[PDB]
Design a protein around this ligand. Structure first.
Ligand SMILES: COC(=O)CC(=O)NCCCNCc1ccc(-c2ccccc2)c(Cl)c1
Ligand SMILES: COC(=O)CC(=O)NCCCNCc1ccc(-c2ccccc2)c(Cl)c1
Ligand SMILES: COC(=O)CC(=O)NCCCNCc1ccc(-c2ccccc2)c(Cl)c1
Ligand SMILES: Cc1ccc(O)c(C(=O)O)c1
Length: 328
């Protein structure tokens, strides 16, 4: 009679018990600031429907970041604004400082606190085992907070984690794909970036939850400790599941599909094959052995699981022995 329903093991009913004002982003009243308070400095990057600039707030001479959105879907912009306002002040969440519009071009923009991004290319060679544990803990603070607030980020990846290494400061950014969690809701599986997509998205299981972010975090941890970027290198969404199955094995994949009565897409028929469950110790090499430990591999094993309900929650992850050396 179709797939088996699922719900989050934590913060299941946080939105259910809150008034509509909190989660009904379509009814939210957006109020513009003065675009003339900002002078654009330089282009930082581009998204599918966004351009990000460093700017200066001319009223206080403080640097900010301005994300100009191509308003292809108004409802999506309202959602990102409402989520950002709800989460404002959370640990390691990027702070939305203002929302402005360009009257001429009819374009909205979001203004954020400035983060001085450290270029990872130089950082990646210098990070120690302790540094990886420290920053992983900072990401978990951000995720436990947003999950506790009934929000799934749905786009956890290295590009969305900004680190100012000199000040040991981390911010989780780009809440454009984030959504409110409502138990039993069937969500769109076209979220997250290919390498970071959880198995639930790849098998088109729509009743997913906060645990999706924990898979994505597991992919980032594996890539950092093993110095393998990305860890699961799929060439398309179907091949992405095959890359996962080459590590986790096909036996546990069938156990997962069976548990939720998922119908595997026919496109998997000639590409999935048969794969044994690999030991995590097989990814250890001379280049990465100084970042790997038994505690790291046990932690990784508890995140990178097909069954979304079996993965550690952000709060359980924070209590793992891997973080015994970090200040809580
Ligand atoms: N967005 C879809 C949505 C919005 C609100 C709810 C809801 C929240 C609280 C009480 C009753 C319904 C649900 Cl289930 C889904
Ligand atoms: C003296 C400052 C004059 N104003 C400069 C300016 C102009 C336009 C925008 C803008 C806002 C929203 C969407 C696109 C562009 C911004 Cl941020 C600043
Ligand atoms: C144009 O858009 C923007 O300006 C945004 C923008 O500039 N983004 C680039 C941010 C790239 N961050 C790279 C990075 C570095 C280290 C880690 C990490 C290492 C060890 C443990 C935990 C995390 C992560 Cl996850 C990411
Ligand atoms: C600070 C910052 C930089 C780039 C971005 O794309 C964002 C965001 O989308 O929230 C934030």
């Amino acid at each position: 009679s179709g797939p088996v329903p699922s719900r989050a093991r934590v913060y299941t009913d946080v939105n259910t018990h809150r008034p509509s004002e909190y989660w009904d982003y379509e009814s939210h009243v957006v109020e513009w600031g003065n675009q003339d308070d900002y002078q654009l400095v330089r282009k930082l990057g581009r998204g599918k429907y966004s351009e990000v600039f460093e700017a200066i707030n001319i009223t206080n001479n403080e640097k900010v970041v301005v994300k100009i959105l191509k308003p292809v879907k108004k409802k999506k912009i309202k959602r990102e604004i409402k989520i950002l306002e709800n989460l404002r002040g959370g640990p390691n969440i990027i702070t939305l400082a203002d929302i402005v519009k360009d009257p001429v071009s009819r374009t909205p923009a979001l203004v954020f606190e400035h983060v001085n991004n450290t270029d990872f290319k130089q950082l990646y060679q210098t990070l120690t085992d302790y540094d990886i544990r420290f920053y992983m803990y900072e990401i978990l603070k951000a995720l436990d907070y947003c999950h506790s607030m009934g929000i799934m980020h749905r786009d956890v990846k290295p590009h969305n984690v900004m680190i100012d290494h000199e000040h040991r400061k981390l911010r989780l950014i780009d809440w454009g794909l984030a959504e409110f969690y409502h138990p039993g809701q069937e969500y769109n599986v076209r979220v997250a970036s290919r390498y970071f997509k959880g198995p639930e998205l790849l098998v088109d299981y729509q009743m997913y939850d906060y645990s999706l972010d924990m898979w994505s975090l597991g992919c980032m941890l594996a890539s950092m400790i093993f110095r393998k970027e990305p860890f699961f290198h799929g060439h398309d969404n179907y091949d992405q599941l095959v890359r996962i199955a080459k590590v986790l094995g096909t036996e546990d994949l069938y156990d997962y599909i069976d548990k939720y009565n998922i119908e595997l897409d026919p496109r998997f028929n000639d590409i999935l094959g048969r794969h044994s469950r690999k030991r995590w110790e097989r990814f250890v090499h001379s280049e990465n052995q100084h970042l790997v430990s038994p505690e790291a591999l046990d932690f990784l094993d508890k995140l990178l699981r097909y069954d979304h309900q079996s993965r550690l929650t952000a709060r359980e992850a924070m209590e793992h022995p891997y973080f015994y050396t970090v200040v809580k």
